[PDB]
Design a protein around this ligand. Sequence first.
Ligand code: CLA
Ligand code: CLA
Ligand code: CLA
Ligand code: CLA
Ligand code: CLA
Ligand code: CLA
Ligand SMILES: CC1=C(/C=C/C(C)=C/C=C/C(C)=C/C=C/C=C(C)/C=C/C=C(C)/C=C/C2=C(C)C(=O)CCC2(C)C)C(C)(C)CCC1=O
Ligand SMILES: CC1=C(/C=C/C(C)=C/C=C/C(C)=C/C=C/C=C(C)/C=C/C=C(C)/C=C/C2=C(C)CCCC2(C)C)C(C)(C)CCC1
Ligand SMILES: CC1=C(/C=C/C(C)=C/C=CC(/C)=C/C=C/C=C(C)/C=C/C=C(C)/C=C/C2=C(C)CCCC2(C)C)C(C)(C)CCC1
Ligand SMILES: CC1=C(/C=C/C(C)=C/C=CC(/C)=C/C=C/C=C(C)/C=C/C=C(C)/C=C/C2=C(C)CCCC2(C)C)C(C)(C)CCC1
Ligand SMILES: CC1=C(/C=C/C(C)=C\C=C\C(C)=C\C=C\C=C(C)\C=C\C=C(C)/C=C/C2=C(C)CCCC2(C)C)C(C)(C)CCC1
Ligand SMILES: CC(C)=CCC/C(C)=C\CC/C(C)=C\CC/C(C)=C/CC1=C(C)C(=O)c2ccccc2C1=O
Lengths: 31, 103, 103, 154, 154, 154, 73, 31, 31, 31, 75
Amino acid sequence: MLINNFEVAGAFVAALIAGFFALMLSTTLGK
Amino acid sequence: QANSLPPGASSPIFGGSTGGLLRKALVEEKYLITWGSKEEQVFEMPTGGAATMVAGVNGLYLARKEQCHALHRQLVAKFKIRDSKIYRVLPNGEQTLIYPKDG
Amino acid sequence: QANSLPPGASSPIFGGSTGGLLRKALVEEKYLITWGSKEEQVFEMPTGGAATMVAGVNGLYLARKEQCHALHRQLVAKFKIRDSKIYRVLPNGEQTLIYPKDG
Amino acid sequence: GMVSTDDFQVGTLLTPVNNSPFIKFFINNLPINRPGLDPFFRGLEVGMAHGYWLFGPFVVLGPLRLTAFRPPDIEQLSILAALISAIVVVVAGTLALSLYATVGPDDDTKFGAEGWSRFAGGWLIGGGGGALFAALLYLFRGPLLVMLLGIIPG
Amino acid sequence: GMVSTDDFQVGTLLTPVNNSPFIKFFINNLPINRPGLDPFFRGLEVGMAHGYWLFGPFVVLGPLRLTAFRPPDIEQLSILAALISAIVVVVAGTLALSLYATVGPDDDTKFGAEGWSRFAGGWLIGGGGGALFAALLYLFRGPLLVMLLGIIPG
Amino acid sequence: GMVSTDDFQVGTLLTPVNNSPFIKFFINNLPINRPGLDPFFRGLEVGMAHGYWLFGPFVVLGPLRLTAFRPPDIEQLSILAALISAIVVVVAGTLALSLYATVGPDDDTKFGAEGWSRFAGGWLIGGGGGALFAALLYLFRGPLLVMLLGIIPG
Amino acid sequence: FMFLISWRGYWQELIETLVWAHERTPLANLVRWKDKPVAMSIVQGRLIGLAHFTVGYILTYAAFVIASTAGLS
Amino acid sequence: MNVYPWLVYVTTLVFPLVSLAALFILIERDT
Amino acid sequence: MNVYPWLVYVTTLVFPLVSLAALFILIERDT
Amino acid sequence: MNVYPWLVYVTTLVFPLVSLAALFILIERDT
Amino acid sequence: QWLTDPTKVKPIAHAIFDPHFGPGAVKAFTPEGGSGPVNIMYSGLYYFWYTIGIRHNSELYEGAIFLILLAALFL
Ligand code: CLA
Ligand code: CLA
Ligand code: CLA
Ligand code: CLA
Ligand code: CLA
Ligand code: CLA
Ligand SMILES: CC1=C(/C=C/C(C)=C/C=C/C(C)=C/C=C/C=C(C)/C=C/C=C(C)/C=C/C2=C(C)C(=O)CCC2(C)C)C(C)(C)CCC1=O
Ligand SMILES: CC1=C(/C=C/C(C)=C/C=C/C(C)=C/C=C/C=C(C)/C=C/C=C(C)/C=C/C2=C(C)CCCC2(C)C)C(C)(C)CCC1
Ligand SMILES: CC1=C(/C=C/C(C)=C/C=CC(/C)=C/C=C/C=C(C)/C=C/C=C(C)/C=C/C2=C(C)CCCC2(C)C)C(C)(C)CCC1
Ligand SMILES: CC1=C(/C=C/C(C)=C/C=CC(/C)=C/C=C/C=C(C)/C=C/C=C(C)/C=C/C2=C(C)CCCC2(C)C)C(C)(C)CCC1
Ligand SMILES: CC1=C(/C=C/C(C)=C\C=C\C(C)=C\C=C\C=C(C)\C=C\C=C(C)/C=C/C2=C(C)CCCC2(C)C)C(C)(C)CCC1
Ligand SMILES: CC(C)=CCC/C(C)=C\CC/C(C)=C\CC/C(C)=C/CC1=C(C)C(=O)c2ccccc2C1=O
């Protein structure tokens, strides 16, 4: 059994948390 | 810059609130209360929060003359300070005395 | 017009090339060499081709200072002219001497 | 350190939502604040983004949407109705911008009444075009969302 | 009473066709005269009104119109032909407006040559858009002029 | 006689490719050089010419073209694909024009950043319109290139 | 009943917070009102509450007195 | 039936928004 | 039947209006 | 299959050209 | 599906969405019993995940979640 769309959406919520922290780190590295 | 004090008056320490000036202070009118304090002490802002004023001459820009006259009655009823003078600042930089108009 | 010689200098006979001036001479800087010839004699252009200088003072506008300096060294090494003066020309028309500085 | 004010009398706060440099880069290079742009192009880009997204709720959620309706023959009426709906919403926004313009704006943009009318005009063309472009990509989402070359022969 | 002249050397009459206050409100707020408008938006609104009505005579009266032709198979050809006809009439108007602009206009507008070229540009986009909008609502007049919900099932 | 140079120090050659008077009338009345035009109209006309020709290689040469495909049901997909392809090429040109505009142009045009943004906006609207107009004439070239009146009855 | 019970100075202070929220929202403080948002006046608050009370009264009873009598059968 | 539906679209939807825009011009432009 | 119809559309319809517009530019612009 | 192909269009085609346009704005504007 | 027969069926990296493929390549990168074109994995991760004891796609999913949140923690 493969992975449905709801768990891919949960992985995208987790990646959004990761993307926010990457977006904060890259800008404060740019200072 | 746009809210520069007259020479002789120093700014009280306030951390900035959201209740202060709006676009009317840029385009129509704003107001300025200038008083003299003998020490550094803590007064409630008329727009929310608390500020600390220093010994000497302190000036504060407000959106509204009733905000200034409420600040003035707070200084009288708490700190016995009666030399507040209230100016109306126009956006070109003109300053006129509107309390005490008698002197 | 946009490339006008100083009064006293005459243009050498050249049929104009494509190696010459570009937009930088309009917008940033250009350079001007003036030399003194005793006769009309045939010299290689630094930008390609051949030109003839007439007797008198000849002025030429070039994009770089090295083109003017190479033209001056070719005039020394072939035709024995050592009074070339190289100037730096700004787009507003202000004139300064850059070769020789010492005199 | 994070919450400062510069001007402590103006009723505003310098906060990481306000004062961090990537949001200031995003907002100051969103079209209405992006430097070196005529108001017409600003309204055009705002219109294209808006009119592109405005097609979507009308085609998924509107009165012509179901799988219980009549074939996908109703789907073309759905795309056409959603396209007209997004254009008329852009027209109402254009009416809003140009009624703002024609009574004479006072605002922190340095647009005139003429500048906001350029914005209104760009808004209308960009919005109707964004509606049309979203409708064309919705018509083309059959071959877009699969490998079209492969089921077709030759 | 009704007819005055208010500068009697100037060959004009000030008449309730001329000088009624709602007629002056109408004419003075048609888009070529409505104050606070950049010439492009004036052209845009003039084009949209004109290009919208220009689709009609070509579709009802053109070479492809009748009930004795081949089904509504020719009706899509009628709508497309009238659409192209109204856009090319708008293109001829654009050519007219911009030949007016490029030879250097002297008129009671304070448009320049550049201002009349903005009007020509807005005329073209608005006119072709008004043609396209009248074509889409003419495609939609089947469901528009009936209660569409009610004959479709589910 | 023909290869003159007028400013002989400027690296130029006035040649009959350069200095024929009909070539100067052609180039100096191309839209970017045509006097009396606002930059928006110049961009609009450049866009319409470009977007009209840009449809063609995508519909003849693109991934949906052949007579060995599935009836002429695929030809509507071909016309739609070429239409979206030409509009996205115009969008990329608009992005190019406005990345040129937003960074501060220094050029022989007397356009500002705002004038080049007007040109970018006109380029986008004209190019998408030229793509749409070429798509509509390529929906109509069946009846356009025959005597359509004549094979229809009544 | 909102206009009838809740009165003016609540709504005036609420509109002052809304005025602050509009002048500090980017992409939106560039759109300005021509007439300053204030709360409705005291008499206007009474009148708009009366107008809604009256409109709702009449339409509620008209709906009842027509559909209950037409639905007798 | 005996209906002009386009007239309902004009006078109940288009013309009132038209009229409110005209009264907006009447009540907001100075002179 | 050997016909190029698009060419008839170019030089009998489009190109004469093109030519009258170009001649209008030739006869109505000063210098 | 289990593909989000619209995401492939966004992040492999649209978002790189988006990013190069944004980086062009970063590297070509004075202050 | 690879745990049921590790010696015949090949490891799969990920699936392909490239709109440039014609029909020959679409059927070429599709395996037998597959519903579209994929990449055949040549990096040994299935053998890695077998030896370290992953037996389900749900354990692979919680591994994916844990590595995204551990990356979020390090940023
Ligand atoms: C808020 C409550 C609500 C909601 C969610 C809906 C929703 C809907 N109604 Mg509706 N309706 C409502 C109240 C509501 N109605 C009321 C009070 C009435 C009056 C009695 C009606 C009368 C009505 C009728 C007559 C019809 C509907 C219909 C519909 C459907 C489609 C309409 C449409 O596309 O609009 C368009 C939507 C938009 C233009 C945009 C939506 C707003 C966007 C998505 C907000 C996005 C914000 C964003 C996320 C945040 C910013 C992001 C940024 C910071 C990056 C839709 C599902 C139609 C239908 O067929 O029913 C199924 C229909 O014919 N309604
Ligand atoms: C030879 C002359 C001629 C001919 C044959 C036509 C033929 C037609 N006209 Mg027309 N027209 C003409 C001259 C002509 N017109 C002139 C001189 C004017 C004044 C400039 C107009 C202005 C006009 C308008 C405003 C409309 C037509 C419409 C139509 C179509 C109506 C029939 C139909 O399909 O029902 C279908 C009926 C509808 C689809 C109407 C639906 C309801 C509409 C959308 C409400 C909004 C209409 C409103 C009045 C316009 C906005 C006003 C603005 C100030 C806000 C028909 C094709 C209609 C049309 O173009 O259809 C797309 C229509 O809306 N004409
Ligand atoms: C004036 C006389 C006249 C009239 C009424 C017509 C009418 C018509 N011709 Mg025709 N024709 C004429 C003379 C005329 N022709 C002449 C002299 C020739 C040259 C020999 C031709 C050659 C010709 C050909 C070859 C064809 C026609 C065709 C047609 C039909 C459609 C064409 C069309 O849509 O045009 C477009 C119409 C417009 C762009 C707008 C019309 C004008 C508007 C409605 C005026 C509105 C003013 C408004 C009411 C007042 C302002 C209002 C404001 C104050 C509010 C149409 C019924 C076609 C056909 O198929 O026949 C059936 C066709 O192929 N004609
Ligand atoms: C130059 C070599 C070349 C040529 C001629 C082609 C041609 C083609 N390719 Mg291709 N390709 C190439 C190299 C080339 N490719 C390379 C290096 C790659 C990368 C590996 C690809 C990958 C590729 C893919 C994936 C696909 C193609 C496809 C195609 C076809 C349509 C694409 C299209 O419409 O583009 C658009 C064309 C334009 C927007 C304009 C063309 C340029 C104009 C005509 C120049 C005009 C100049 C003018 C005459 C002079 C000025 C006139 C003025 C002075 C008056 C087409 C026949 C598609 C296909 O289906 O194959 C059949 C397809 O899917 N190619
Ligand atoms: C006391 C009551 C009151 C009254 C009579 C007015 C009256 C007015 N206001 Mg004000 N206003 C008020 C309170 C009031 N306001 C308050 C409490 C605030 C917040 C501080 C504002 C802030 C405000 C601003 C910024 C502006 C006005 C403006 C106006 C004028 C036009 C109304 C309008 O814009 O339509 C507004 C319509 C709605 C609120 C309905 C919302 C419907 C939704 C959005 C769907 C509509 C669809 C549409 C197509 C949008 C979809 C696209 C979108 C998703 C992009 C009008 C005379 C404008 C003006 O001065 O004109 C030049 C103007 O710029 N007002
Ligand atoms: C960082 C490693 C990585 C790599 C190389 C790939 C590669 C790929 N992915 Mg995947 N993806 C990843 C992480 C990764 N992904 C993660 C962690 C998730 C869970 C949220 C996903 C969610 C995902 C989905 C739903 C899909 C893909 C798909 C694809 C394929 C097409 C590209 C695409 O649109 O996806 C877009 C991916 C996202 C929008 C989210 C990715 C988030 C990652 C972590 C950002 C990467 C940042 C990176 C570490 C920084 C490197 C910078 C460097 C350039 C200097 C492609 C082969 C598609 C596919 O299956 O092909 C047929 C598909 O539909 N990915
Ligand atoms: C919320 C919500 C949803 C989600 C919708 C969404 C919006 C889902 C999320 C979609 C996305 C697009 C999440 C973004 C993942 C991007 C990531 C991890 C980036 C890493 C970049 C990195 C490490 C950088 C390295 C870098 C550093 C640090 C530098 O210093 C400079 C270089 C470089 C840039 C390379 C759902 C609908 C799905 C569910 C319901 C729901 O509520
Ligand atoms: C004077 C008057 C009158 C008359 C009127 C008339 C004449 C009418 C009309 C009318 C009309 C004539 C109307 C119209 C209209 C329109 C419209 C409403 C339009 C539109 C459009 C659009 C919206 C478009 C869009 C677009 C663009 C632009 C771009 C791209 C494409 C598209 C499509 C998207 C009477 C006596 C009766 C009354 C009083 C007043
Ligand atoms: C903030 C942000 C975000 C969000 C975003 C969003 C919200 C999204 C989106 C989106 C969108 C919303 C997009 C869009 C778009 C669009 C387009 C791309 C358009 C277009 C168009 C066109 C192209 C048109 C054209 C035309 C014209 C104009 C004229 C004529 C007609 C035509 C059609 C041709 C996030 C958080 C996530 C991340 C970070 C940032
Ligand atoms: C140089 C020359 C030549 C060449 C030429 C050429 C190259 C060609 C061409 C051509 C072309 C290339 C043409 C074109 C065109 C076009 C057009 C005509 C267009 C259009 C359009 C339109 C009309 C659009 C519209 C619209 C809009 C804008 C918006 C909305 C949508 C629409 C669609 C409506 C020769 C040698 C031969 C001769 C001499 C001169
Ligand atoms: C996921 C994954 C991965 C990664 C990994 C990592 C990087 C990590 C980790 C890690 C982990 C997963 C871990 C863990 C752990 C656990 C623990 C650590 C536990 C516990 C418990 C307890 C209960 C304890 C208790 C105690 C204490 C408290 C102290 C000491 C002593 C005693 C025992 C008492 C890999 C790539 C390989 C593959 C696939 C996926
Ligand atoms: C030209 C024109 C009218 C355009 C239409 C303008 C547009 C877009 C919507 C129309 C306005 C709307 C819908 C609301 C605003 C009314 C408002 C300030 C209500 C708050 C308020 C409430 C709730 C009370 O209970 C109350 C009680 C006693 C005294 C005062 C108040 C009071 O102030």
